[PDB]
């Protein structure tokens, strides 16, 4: 009974492997001009936290920031002039996620408490109060993204993903597919959905449908993922000191962003406008700026005194915000 | 050069800074201790004796506030959420000491202690070892299957010699003999002075940390 099932599964595996397999992007990108050297200098230094910050998100206006650290504090920032717009106390000090709603009305936070809390910013009486406290996950939440003003997607360590409804805290959709899910990236059109797990794999789901659409395999656990601005590709960063780029329409791997001088994993991954600079926040006390279309590194963003945790890029590509295990958040331009 | 709007929006930031400054110094007077023992070894019987995810307990003793974090039923990869506990004053490891008769999960406890003690994040964090459940172990000496599980080993039937041998075995599992320090208490079912031992241990480790930071060590 088990032998027949194993043979059948192996038949499918080798069939899809042979079907998904001459040219290479790294070879076809020859005889082209590289970007050169990027040496952007820090423009803003942000203080106030006394802990290791873990997550952040740029606002939709490219001027407001949200920051969460290992202390029970959530800070709304002002990147233009350094002013603390508002501070919010968290019930749970262990938080790993951040989210800024596109409307700017709500923020989200979650951590080891297995629940995600929504805070409302623009309210009467000049206060920020909890709007919803969604629960139903057995584990630690890894990422949260606002699909819309009323829909949110959460990935936790229970090897499943959830699509919720703010109006009614009941779960709307559950995605099952192992290893702990560590990162989440939302489609630019908010139509698709991707999640990378600890089993050295990533999965692309269908938000409307509710079932997995595609799978990608590389090795070690994956803890960073982000969509390309086009929406037909994404970038992943694993703990094996290797960064990779995958294409939805190809179901293959293009090139590896690795160097023999680094044996350190990747903590955060992000892109810029037009998808030309891929910024990878490593755990070797500094970030790196790879060329997403080239196999050669371009620039290094040093200046942090500890492991870089979070990393964000504005919607218009005007500044890059980096955070690390030291409580200073830096804005680079 | 600031406008009337901007001038009034700087005092807001100053008030926020003052609030975080006064709030941030209240979290530096509390000592963090991490429970990491086995679930059925007696953790539930020791948290209440002193008086979903992570459980936080707040105690007071000798005008000192203790925060105790229990990761009871996370059931996730320990390598992905153990970073948050870097900098914890001490790790309280607890064992049942009477689970060698399963023949084994005693080797599982030994492996777990080896993994936690030799962790890269806890290279300078003290470990307090609690050997519990003495009543059953002492009352099973009549037909203790210690020779059955270890046919090649020979020893006395007295429980004190076995306790000394097993404490030595747990101590020898340590690989960093210069930074870390394992403390054993011999906790019992009906003990009352468990808090005093942990208070003395944290006082000793904080004095040693102050001496190291000052420059003498």
């Amino acid at each position, epitope marked *: 009974e088990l032998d027949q099932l194993r043979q059948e599964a192996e038949q499918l595996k080798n069939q899809i492997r042979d079907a998904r397999k001459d040219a290479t992007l790294s070879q076809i990108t020859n005889n082209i001009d590289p970007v050169g050297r990027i040496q952007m200098r820090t423009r803003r230094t942000l203080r106030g936290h006394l802990a290791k910050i873990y997550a952040m998100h740029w606002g939709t206006d490219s001027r407001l920031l949200v920051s969460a650290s290992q202390d029970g504090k959530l800070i709304i920032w*002002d990147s*233009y*002039t350094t*002013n603390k*717009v*508002h501070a919010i106390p968290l019930r749970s000090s262990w938080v790993m996620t951040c989210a800024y709603a596109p409307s700017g009305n709500y923020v989200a936070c979650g951590g080891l408490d297995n629940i995600c809390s929504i805070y409302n910013l623009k309210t*009467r*009486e*000049g*206060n920020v109060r909890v709007s919803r406290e969604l629960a139903g996950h057995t584990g630690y939440l890894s990422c949260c993204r606002f699909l819309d003003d009323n829909q949110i997607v959460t990935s936790s360590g229970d090897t499943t993903c959830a699509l919720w409804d703010i109006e009614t805290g009941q779960q709307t959709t559950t995605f099952t597919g192992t290893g702990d899910v560590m990162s989440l990236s939302l489609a630019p059109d908010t139509r698709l959905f991707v999640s990378g797990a600890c089993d050295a794999s990533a999965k692309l789901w269908d938000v409307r449908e509710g079932m997995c659409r595609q799978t990608f395999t590389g090795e070690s656990d994956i803890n960073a993922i982000c969509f390309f601005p086009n929406g037909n590709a994404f970038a992943t960063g694993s703990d094996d000191a290797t960064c990779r780029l995958f294409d939805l329409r190809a179901d293959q791997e293009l090139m590896t962003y690795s160097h023999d001088n680094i044996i350190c994993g990747i903590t955060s991954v992000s892109f810029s406008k037009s998808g030309r600079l891929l910024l990878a926040g490593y755990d070797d006390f500094n970030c790196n700026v790879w060329d997403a279309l080239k196999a050669d590194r371009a620039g290094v963003l040093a200046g942090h005194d500890n492991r870089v945790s979070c990393l964000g890029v504005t919607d218009d590509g005007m500044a890059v915000a980096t955070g690390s295990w030291d409580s200073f958040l830096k804005i680079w331009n | 050069t600031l*406008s*009337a*709007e*901007d*001038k*009034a*929006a700087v*005092e*807001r*930031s*100053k*008030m926020i800074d003052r609030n975080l400054r006064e709030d941030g110094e209240k979290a530096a007077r509390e000592v963090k201790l991490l429970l990491l023992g086995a679930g059925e070894s007696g953790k539930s019987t020791i948290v209440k004796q002193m008086k979903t995810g992570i459980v936080e307990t707040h105690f007071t003793f000798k005008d000192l506030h203790f925060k105790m974090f229990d990761v009871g039923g996370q059931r996730s990869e320990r390598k992905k959420w153990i970073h948050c506990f870097e900098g914890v004053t001490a790790i309280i490891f607890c064992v049942a000491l009477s689970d060698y008769d399963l023949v084994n999960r005693m080797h599982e406890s030994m492996k777990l202690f080896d993994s936690i003690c030799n962790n890269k994040w806890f290279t300078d964090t003290s470990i307090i070892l609690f050997l519990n459940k003495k009543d059953l172990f002492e009352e099973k000496i009549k037909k203790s299957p210690l020779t059955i599980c270890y046919p090649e080993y020979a020893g006395s039937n007295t429980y004190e010699e076995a306790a000394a041998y097993i404490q030595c075995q747990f101590e020898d599992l340590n690989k960093r003999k210069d930074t870390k320090e394992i403390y054993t208490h011999f906790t019992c079912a009906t003990d009352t002075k468990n808090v005093q031992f942990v208070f003395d241990a944290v006082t000793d480790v904080i004095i040693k940390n102050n001496l190291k930071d000052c420059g003498l060590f």
Partner: single-chain antibody
Amino acid sequence: VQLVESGGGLVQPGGSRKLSCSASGFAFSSFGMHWVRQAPEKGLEWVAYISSGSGTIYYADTVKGRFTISRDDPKNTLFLQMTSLRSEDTAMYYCVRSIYYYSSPFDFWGQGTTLTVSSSDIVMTQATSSVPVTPGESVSISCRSSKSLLHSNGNTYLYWFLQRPGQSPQLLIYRPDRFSGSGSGTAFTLTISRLEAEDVGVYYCMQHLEYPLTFGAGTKLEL
């Protein structure tokens, strides 16, 4: 949700009294709170302003050293102490509040209290004066800035308080639905999509950039 001003002013000349105000359901500890008066025929102008934390006690140029403001955040009470009463105190006092993020100041206005006695000036002129409202059409309000209200930050100061016949004014633009505002340099235009019986009232225009927000200059467009 509620801001009640108390203290009825009717005393013999030569005395002093207090005018208090209390707020319900507000974060009074994080709100700046101005004080304004309305004459029988005039606009709205500052008489006092206090910021959060009590670090800014700006007063008015008309009266100085006689009026003072005291605040109690735990008691949620703000009151005015007045000394050396003069004949020019026959106004309705209001206790508007505001807050400044890095966002809509002068939002809520109080009911106000009476102040009566028992028995170098900026001026603006417009080509149109007291234009009656023609039924079946829509009215538009034009305004020009004497100085350059636009700041280097691009934050043009443009307030359009509307006072219906009643108790307290309201906000139209802080920097309804039918009310709209079009700005071009020194020219400002308020537009109303449709008229209604509740749309009739008095409008006031902006002439302030510096510390004293004296925007009391404004034509009475009741008819």
